[PDB]
Amino acid sequence: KVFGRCELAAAMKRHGLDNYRGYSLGNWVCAAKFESNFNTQATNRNTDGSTDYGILQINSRWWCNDGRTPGSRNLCNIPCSALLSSDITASVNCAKKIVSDGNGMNAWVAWRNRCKGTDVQAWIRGCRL
Ligand SMILES: [Cl-]
Ligand SMILES: [Cl-]
Ligand SMILES: [Cl-]
Ligand SMILES: [Cl-]
Ligand SMILES: [Cl-]
Ligand SMILES: [Cl-]
Ligand SMILES: [Cl-]
Ligand code: NA
């Protein structure tokens, strides 16, 4: 599924991400824009052989099982395929664990490089929320 901007903002708010760990909804929408362009089926292979999955490009090194990432963990206790669903519940629940891990949203390098410190409220501007 390719979400619209305000469509995703609404879905993220419905699943309790808005101000989760103090990160406003615009932070989460911005991260999803640059990680996946709002596409739930986004995948990207890392140089180390891990893969990133879904709207928030969650990595198989730590967070999900894809059976092809040696020495990895599965701390969200999900198959990485769950992260590609039209239903964002598994991505949101796993993102809540990642953002609790100690470095907040810096876990998402695209958030650090493209969203952090910017006017992230622009990402939810106009949306009925
Ligand atoms: Cl957009
Ligand atoms: Cl915001
Ligand atoms: Cl594996
Ligand atoms: Cl594990
Ligand atoms: Cl699995
Ligand atoms: Cl959803
Ligand atoms: Cl933080
Ligand atoms: Na894994």
Swiss-Prot record:
It is an enzyme of class 3 (hydrolase). Its EC number is 3.2.1.17. Residues 1-129 form the C-type lysozyme domain. Keywords: Allergen, Antimicrobial, Bacteriolytic enzyme, Disulfide bond, Glycosidase, Hydrolase, Secreted, Signal. It comes from the Eukaryota. GO terms for biological process: cell wall macromolecule catabolic process; defense response to bacterium; defense response to Gram-negative bacterium; defense response to Gram-positive bacterium; killing of cells of another organism. Its main location: secreted. SMART domains: LYZ1 (SM00263). One of its GO terms (molecular function) is identical protein binding. The keyword Membrane does not apply. Gene3D superfamilies: 1.10.530.10. It catalyses: Hydrolysis of (1->4)-beta-linkages between N-acetylmuramic acid and N-acetyl-D-glucosamine residues in a peptidoglycan and between N-acetyl-D-glucosamine residues in chitodextrins. In the egg white and polymorphonuclear leukocytes. One of its GO terms (cellular component) is endoplasmic reticulum. Pfam families: Lys (PF00062). Substrate binds at residue 101. Disulfide bonds join 6-127, 30-115, 64-80, 76-94. The active site is at residues 35, 52. It is found in: Secreted. Coiled coil: none annotated. PANTHER family: LYSOZYME C. Lysozymes have primarily a bacteriolytic function; those in tissues and body fluids are associated with the monocyte-macrophage system and enhance the activity of immunoagents. Has bacteriolytic activity against M.luteus. Monomer. Lysozyme C is capable of both hydrolysis and transglycosylation; it also shows a slight esterase activity. It acts rapidly on both peptide-substituted and unsubstituted peptidoglycan, and slowly on chitin oligosaccharides. This is Lysozyme C. It comes from Gallus gallus. The lineage of its organism: Eukaryota, Metazoa, Chordata, Craniata, Vertebrata. The gene is LYZ.
